[PDB]
Amino acid sequence: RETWGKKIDFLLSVVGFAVDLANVWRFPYLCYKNGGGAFLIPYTLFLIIAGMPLFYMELALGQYNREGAATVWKICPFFKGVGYAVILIALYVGFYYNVIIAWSLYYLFSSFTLNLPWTDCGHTWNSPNCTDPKLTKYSKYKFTPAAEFYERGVLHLHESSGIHDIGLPQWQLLLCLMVVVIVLYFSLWKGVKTSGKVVWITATLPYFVLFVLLVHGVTLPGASNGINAYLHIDFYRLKEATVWIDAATQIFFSLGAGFGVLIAFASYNKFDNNCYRDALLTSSINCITSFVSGFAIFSILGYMAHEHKVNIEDVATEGAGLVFILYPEAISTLSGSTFWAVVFFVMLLALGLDSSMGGMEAVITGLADDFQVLKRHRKLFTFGVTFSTFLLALFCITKGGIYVLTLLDTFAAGTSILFAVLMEAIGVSWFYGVDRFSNDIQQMMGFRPGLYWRLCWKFVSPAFLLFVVVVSIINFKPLTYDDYIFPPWANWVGWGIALSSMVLVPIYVIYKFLSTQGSLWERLAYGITPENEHHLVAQRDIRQFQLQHWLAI
Amino acid sequence: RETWGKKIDFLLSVVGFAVDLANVWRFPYLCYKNGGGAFLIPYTLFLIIAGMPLFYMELALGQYNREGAATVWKICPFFKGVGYAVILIALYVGFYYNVIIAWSLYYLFSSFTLNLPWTDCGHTWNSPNCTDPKLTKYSKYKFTPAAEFYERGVLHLHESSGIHDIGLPQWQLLLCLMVVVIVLYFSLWKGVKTSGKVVWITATLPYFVLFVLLVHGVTLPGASNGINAYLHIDFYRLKEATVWIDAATQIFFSLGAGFGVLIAFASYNKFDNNCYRDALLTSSINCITSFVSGFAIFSILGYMAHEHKVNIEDVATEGAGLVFILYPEAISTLSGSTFWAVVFFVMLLALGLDSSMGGMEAVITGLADDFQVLKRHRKLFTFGVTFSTFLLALFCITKGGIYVLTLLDTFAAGTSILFAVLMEAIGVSWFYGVDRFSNDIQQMMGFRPGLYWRLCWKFVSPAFLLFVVVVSIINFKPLTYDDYIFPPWANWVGWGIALSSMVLVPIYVIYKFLSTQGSLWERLAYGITPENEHHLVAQRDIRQFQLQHWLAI
Numbered sequence A, B: 001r002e003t004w005g006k007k008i009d010f011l012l013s014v015v016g017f018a019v020d021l022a023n024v025w026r027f028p029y030l031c032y033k034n035g036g037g038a039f040l041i042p043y044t045l046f047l048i049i050a051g052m053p054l055f056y057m058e059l060a061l062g063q064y065n066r067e068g069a070a071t072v073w074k075i076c077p078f079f080k081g082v083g084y085a086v087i088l089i090a091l092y093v094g095f096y097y098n099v100i101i102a103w104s105l106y107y108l109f110s111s112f113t114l115n116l117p118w119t120d121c122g123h124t125w126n127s128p129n130c131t132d133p134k135l136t137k138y139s140k141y142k143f144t145p146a147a148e149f150y151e152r153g154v155l156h157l158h159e160s161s162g163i164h165d166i167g168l169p170q171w172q173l174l175l176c177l178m179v180v181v182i183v184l185y186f187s188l189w190k191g192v193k194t195s196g197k198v199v200w201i202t203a204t205l206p207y208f209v210l211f212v213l214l215v216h217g218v219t220l221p222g223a224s225n226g227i228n229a230y231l232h233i234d235f236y237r238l239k240e241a242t243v244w245i246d247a248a249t250q251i252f253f254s255l256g257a258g259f260g261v262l263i264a265f266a267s268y269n270k271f272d273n274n275c276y277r278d279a280l281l282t283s284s285i286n287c288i289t290s291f292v293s294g295f296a297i298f299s300i301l302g303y304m305a306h307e308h309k310v311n312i313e314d315v316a317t318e319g320a321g322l323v324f325i326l327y328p329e330a331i332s333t334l335s336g337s338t339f340w341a342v343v344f345f346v347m348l349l350a351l352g353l354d355s356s357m358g359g360m361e362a363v364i365t366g367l368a369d370d371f372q373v374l375k376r377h378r379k380l381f382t383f384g385v386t387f388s389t390f391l392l393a394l395f396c397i398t399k400g401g402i403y404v405l406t407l408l409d410t411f412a413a414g415t416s417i418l419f420a421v422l423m424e425a426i427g428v429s430w431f432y433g434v435d436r437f438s439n440d441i442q443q444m445m446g447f448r449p450g451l452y453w454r455l456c457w458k459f460v461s462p463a464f465l466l467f468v469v470v471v472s473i474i475n476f477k478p479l480t481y482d483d484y485i486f487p488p489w490a491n492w493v494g495w496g497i498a499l500s501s502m503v504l505v506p507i508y509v510i511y512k513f514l515s516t517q518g519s520l521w522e523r524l525a526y527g528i529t530p531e532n533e534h535h536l537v538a539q540r541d542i543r544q545f546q547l548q549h550w551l552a553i
């Protein structure tokens, strides 16, 4: 297998992997939808007890097994079905993640203008309802130039009444997505890249942009209200279950657990990489980045509330287009809006593409370790993955493609990834054993995990994942894009898409049971024991059939 | 490879293969849409000059190459891309052919009743507009019990305004299609069947049913008008180009040319089977069956026109549901309608399933000869093909699935199959050579083809195929289900589906050119010469680069 270069394996380079589109785009709107302040406590809790333990576990598993997202379960075939699952989950992300980058690309095409299109009204897409503060509603107040440009000048949402009538893909977004998938193909057709300019620029540009945004927000008039709202904890929202689900999903998106990216990345690392320090640094940097991003978001929200004289909770939307409304307007206030807008759009395109490459690599590395034919047909396989994503994403660039994008973001990567990571934790801590995992970590790095890590991997994280799965399944809420209630059939289609990845585990356990020849004992042994230890099936020496294995702790 | 049993290889068994759903369902409505009488001349002409020559050519090619639908082009790689094409074309058929059988299955569920649901009004699905002759419009007159039961009680077309709002799949049609695909899987998971009861009953039941229908129609009052209309030739319709396209498509559907069924069937035949006599008998029996089916259809049309006092051209629809309106009502007139209806529905289910098995075999035999992995994973591969068809066909059992079914029947199997068979004829008669084909036929059967067959394979059939392709592309007409004009985007989607199979040829020639290593000369030689004769590329002895090859005649 290949190995990453010294540039990306540096101690000060992991921060480059810490940045992701979820922390720049998804975390802002998730926190705004959850109120702000009431979302940081569940986020930090799931990071310290669930996110970081699963992060370390996936890193160690990928470093040990030296396999992709699916084959990494060579120690227990009965859980191999979850691998493909997360792969499909990653594929689901490609159905919408690539759609967002192209959006920023269109903004790039709107960035080379003296007068920015999101500054004032009077353009073609601007409806008569467009309101310019320099020159109406307490529900969402979508009558701002930045919102009119995003909904009518980019997505053309005014030409669609709902998800039932999506329309036709806009030619602008069509060409943008074509350029995006072409770059994605030409940046991955030669396998992994030891060192690249793309991963190098994503380590300094995002932090600089966030610092500039913070310095601008702390000086904007009226941002004090947003700052105070961000530092206010609403316990009645903590009593609700949606906040915890959103925090878990955001943690899994930011850290990458549940997509196969971590295992694929660790499969090409060295046999002595200290994943403990890497996990600590990643968690800390991600928490700090999320905190400062939420602070800047609430500062911009307070500024817009002061400028438009609208309430903070009703000044902008709570969907996937929030960062395309708040961030641009602030750039309009800074001197030289053109240069800052260009820099911000280039940063978005960079982090967006770096995330798509990481996610697509997880799909390929896994499917090639499954089928060695695809290992040699990389350029043809890459094309298939990218081209399939481009097509199945043509749905999200239609006049009403934002609805399908939100549906995929809510259901395709909702309870499915939670169930996947729960099955992974169960298969690693119970079926495989915490003792064997600790011995592997010791023989790889030189030290055994403490009581805390093992108790989290075996008891804390699985229990919390089961809890969030239960509250996601039972306490379900209908999807609404802040104004439009999705019809019941849309929710049924979303649940079916989620089940498409969820039921991959029992389907595989059924297949692994029928394909295996022998009695029930032999079938169960071949399904729960590692391949290289299959000889122990002949000697009738199975650890999982002993009480000491499940009581290892 | 396997060999067919003596029961299906008998001289009096080829008639069993002569019967098909196209001659029982598609030919009736195609002839009714084209007027009747003006359609038999183009049909017979395309059968005698285009249909039978291509039939014999495909039979001989499949018997010689001993390969599937795609690999049969081992003599010329540059045309291998057409193989997959026709395979996909066959797959396109599976998107709607399986939907029709299930319909008859529902009729079977409606056949075990004393009072047939298509006899009178008063039921739940029957709208207030239902008219019973025993107890309105000159456009289509869809107010008959048999039409109300088909459009509202089976397809539920009243719950859909157009193709834009298809709706949700009916649970009745859902279970019917599930049973159909289950039977299709359990009847093909063990490869080809040397002898089967299904292919045995399809050789006597269809002819008996057609004879009974003829005897009933010749005695029905008012059928004389339909008989006279069927024996009337409208030359102004022959001047039009749509009649010729419909005749060519019906010939290709009845004979199987353009789907890979003939090549796959001949691949398992013996090395001495006289495909000349088989082609003659098949063409004759198919022509006689089409003639008698059209005669019975026009007799029933005249009877219904006399009973309802409506014009013959406006008494029924011109879509895929004509045979579900004309044939049932006649059964209502015969004594013991229950038994005859059950027999007719069982015959339809039989011929319908026999055609789906033949078409699916063409897809599998071909894809397995392409990839020997799928040869061993037959039950898993079969499942994939059948399951994919079942899903992609869920679209045609929706409230407005008849529109998508008609779109697929018109575009997915329209100009695409014409271009495919044209490319096949060009690759066999010009690139491969008529002389080599004649030598192969001589060494297989013992006699060389006459001047007529070679002139048809080289000059007549390719010219007529080019002509019908030109008149299909230039002289295009918008699709209408006899009342509803399909929107332009529907026609664009149909043309895109057709191009999906059409452009598979240049895509493959491009791939075969890039993958081949060497200069332009070596690439062209490896792309136009047979694999086993690739050594001739080294000796620089290429027949296609000689004037005598293209002037073989």
Ligand SMILES: CCCCCCCCCC(=O)O[C@H](COC(=O)CCCCCCCC)COP(=O)(O)OC[C@@H](O)CO
Pocket (backbone or CB within 6 Å): A080, A084, A370, A371, A500, A501, A507, A508, A511
């Ligand atoms: C939403 C319902 C889908 C039901 C479709 C159910 C087939 C189940 C075959 C199956 O499970 O075989 C796998 C290998 O097959 C694969 O690729 C992935 C199969 C997963 C298909 C999901 C597609 C979803 C869009 C397991 O094969 P293996 O025995 O582990 O290894 C074989 C070779 O790949 C490497 O050894």
Ligand SMILES: CCCCCCCCCC(=O)O[C@H](COC(=O)CCCCCCCC)COP(=O)(O)OC[C@@H](O)CO
Pocket (backbone or CB within 6 Å): B080, B084, B370, B371, B500, B501, B507, B508, B511
């Ligand atoms: C509607 C646009 C599709 C563009 C997608 C374009 C890929 C083109 C690969 C290609 O052409 O490789 C083939 C083998 O690949 C296949 O299966 C069938 C590929 C056809 C895909 C059509 C799917 C349509 C739903 C040829 O491979 P080969 O070199 O002849 O043999 C390889 C092995 O199969 C047997 O030797």
Ligand SMILES: C/C=C/c1ccc(OC[C@@H](O)CN2CCN(Cc3ccccc3)CC2)c(OC)c1
Pocket (backbone or CB within 6 Å): A014, A017, A018, A019, A020, A059, A090, A091, A093, A094, A097, A253, A254, A255, A256, A259, A261, A262, A265, A275, A278, A282, A355, A356, A357, A358, A359, A360
């Ligand atoms: C020693 C370990 C270092 C380390 C630290 C942090 C990392 O980041 C991990 C995250 O950013 C991974 N994203 C998560 C979101 N996407 C998912 C996706 C899926 C499909 C298409 C597009 C996007 C994928 C990207 C990382 O992974 C390379 C490695």
Ligand SMILES: C/C=C/c1ccc(OC[C@@H](O)CN2CCN(Cc3ccccc3)CC2)c(OC)c1
Pocket (backbone or CB within 6 Å): B014, B017, B018, B019, B020, B059, B090, B091, B093, B094, B097, B253, B254, B255, B256, B259, B261, B262, B265, B275, B278, B282, B355, B356, B357, B358, B359, B360
């Ligand atoms: C020596 C030769 C004897 C012979 C004579 C006539 C034959 O019939 C040939 C035709 O009926 C073939 N149909 C054509 C229509 N369908 C297409 C289809 C595709 C996909 C799904 C369902 C249906 C496929 C079926 C034949 O092929 C077995 C062999």
Ligand SMILES: CC(C)CCC[C@@H](C)[C@H]1CC[C@H]2[C@@H]3CC=C4C[C@@H](O)CC[C@]4(C)[C@H]3CC[C@]12C
Pocket (backbone or CB within 6 Å): A095, A163, A164, A165, A166, A392, A395, A404, A493, A497
């Ligand atoms: C085709 C293979 C790759 C699987 C594709 C999975 C995803 C992309 C599919 C599964 C179900 C699909 C949805 C089903 C129905 C509708 C309603 C329609 O009015 C717009 C498209 C929309 C919203 C589809 C978008 C794409 C979708 C979400």
Ligand SMILES: CC(C)CCC[C@@H](C)[C@H]1CC[C@H]2[C@@H]3CC=C4C[C@@H](O)CC[C@]4(C)[C@H]3CC[C@]12C
Pocket (backbone or CB within 6 Å): A167, A168, A169, A388, A389, A391, A392, A394, A395, A398, B489, B493
């Ligand atoms: C199976 C997947 C991976 C590949 C094939 C996907 C194809 C069949 C899908 C993907 C996106 C789809 C398009 C999405 C939206 C529209 C706009 C609508 O007004 C007409 C149909 C049209 C133009 C669809 C045609 C079919 C389409 C191109």
Ligand SMILES: CC(C)CCC[C@@H](C)[C@H]1CC[C@H]2[C@@H]3CC=C4C[C@@H](O)CC[C@]4(C)[C@H]3CC[C@]12C
Pocket (backbone or CB within 6 Å): A168, A169, A170, A171, A174, A391, A394, B496, B500
């Ligand atoms: C090969 C099949 C399965 C999939 C084809 C996918 C691509 C080629 C198709 C699917 C939907 C298509 C789009 C549908 C509608 C429009 C709007 C109009 O401005 C024409 C171009 C444009 C923008 C089309 C471009 C091509 C398109 C994106």
Ligand SMILES: CC(C)CCC[C@@H](C)[C@H]1CC[C@H]2[C@@H]3CC=C4C[C@@H](O)CC[C@]4(C)[C@H]3CC[C@]12C
Pocket (backbone or CB within 6 Å): A370, A371, A372, A373, A374, B373
């Ligand atoms: C020789 C051994 C390793 C077998 C190799 C078989 C490989 C090449 C086959 C078997 C399973 C196949 C996959 C099964 C299903 C799908 C989903 C479909 O939407 C796109 C193609 C794709 C992704 C196939 C690609 C080719 C594939 C990976």
Ligand SMILES: CC(C)CCC[C@@H](C)[C@H]1CC[C@H]2[C@@H]3CC=C4C[C@@H](O)CC[C@]4(C)[C@H]3CC[C@]12C
Pocket (backbone or CB within 6 Å): A178, A181, A182, A185, A379, A383, A386, A387, A390, B514
């Ligand atoms: C709509 C979008 C997704 C289409 C993308 C098409 C891409 C995948 C295709 C189109 C043309 C292709 C190229 C055509 C020819 C060559 C030269 C050959 O020596 C190496 C491969 C290479 C360089 C191909 C790589 C893949 C390629 C760039």
Ligand SMILES: CC(C)CCC[C@@H](C)[C@H]1CC[C@H]2[C@@H]3CC=C4C[C@@H](O)CC[C@]4(C)[C@H]3CC[C@]12C
Pocket (backbone or CB within 6 Å): A373, A374, A377, A380, A381, A384, A387, A388
């Ligand atoms: C599911 C939808 C998106 C279609 C996906 C098509 C993909 C999976 C298909 C299209 C063409 C295929 C390739 C065609 C031929 C070969 C050569 C063979 O020796 C190994 C497999 C390989 C390399 C195939 C891999 C899978 C492949 C790339």
Ligand SMILES: CC(C)CCC[C@@H](C)[C@H]1CC[C@H]2[C@@H]3CC=C4C[C@@H](O)CC[C@]4(C)[C@H]3CC[C@]12C
Pocket (backbone or CB within 6 Å): A507, A510, A511, A514, A515, B379, B380, B383
């Ligand atoms: C219910 C459907 C839609 C989803 C789940 C289907 C699963 C359970 C089915 C579908 C096809 C099945 C396979 C078909 C054939 C074989 C070969 C046989 O020698 C062993 C069992 C095995 C390998 C089956 C295992 C179970 C299987 C994979």
Ligand SMILES: CC(C)CCC[C@@H](C)[C@H]1CC[C@H]2[C@@H]3CC=C4C[C@@H](O)CC[C@]4(C)[C@H]3CC[C@]12C
Pocket (backbone or CB within 6 Å): B095, B163, B164, B165, B166, B392, B395, B404, B493, B497
């Ligand atoms: C997914 C892979 C297997 C390819 C599928 C090809 C066929 C089945 C696809 C290609 C384009 C599709 C059509 C594209 C758009 C529409 C309009 C929508 O209002 C109803 C469905 C309908 C009419 C689709 C039916 C299915 C369709 C015809």
Ligand SMILES: CC(C)CCC[C@@H](C)[C@H]1CC[C@H]2[C@@H]3CC=C4C[C@@H](O)CC[C@]4(C)[C@H]3CC[C@]12C
Pocket (backbone or CB within 6 Å): A489, A493, B167, B168, B169, B388, B389, B391, B392, B394, B395, B398
């Ligand atoms: C790629 C192919 C072979 C397999 C996957 C096909 C899937 C994605 C398609 C095939 C038929 C589709 C369904 C067809 C019609 C409807 C009714 C509509 O009101 C909601 C969506 C729904 C329920 C679709 C959901 C997605 C669907 C199930």
Ligand SMILES: CC(C)CCC[C@@H](C)[C@H]1CC[C@H]2[C@@H]3CC=C4C[C@@H](O)CC[C@]4(C)[C@H]3CC[C@]12C
Pocket (backbone or CB within 6 Å): A496, A500, B168, B169, B170, B171, B174, B391, B394
């Ligand atoms: C796995 C994904 C990709 C495809 C799933 C396809 C099957 C399982 C889905 C697709 C559309 C679904 C149908 C959509 C709507 C209805 C109407 C209502 O009476 C509920 C059942 C029924 C009839 C569903 C049954 C299941 C169904 C047929």
Ligand SMILES: CC(C)CCC[C@@H](C)[C@H]1CC[C@H]2[C@@H]3CC=C4C[C@@H](O)CC[C@]4(C)[C@H]3CC[C@]12C
Pocket (backbone or CB within 6 Å): A373, B370, B371, B372, B373, B374
């Ligand atoms: C070892 C050699 C022979 C390579 C074998 C690779 C085979 C198993 C692979 C390569 C090409 C693949 C196909 C490529 C594309 C598609 C279309 C998709 O909608 C369903 C899966 C399907 C039909 C794949 C099935 C698996 C497949 C046939």
Ligand SMILES: CC(C)CCC[C@@H](C)[C@H]1CC[C@H]2[C@@H]3CC=C4C[C@@H](O)CC[C@]4(C)[C@H]3CC[C@]12C
Pocket (backbone or CB within 6 Å): A514, B178, B181, B182, B185, B383, B386, B387, B390
């Ligand atoms: C919705 C429809 C299409 C689902 C069809 C599912 C079919 C393909 C699946 C479901 C259950 C499967 C069976 C489950 C178990 C066995 C026993 C094994 O020793 C041989 C295969 C066999 C007999 C499988 C054959 C394929 C099978 C019948």
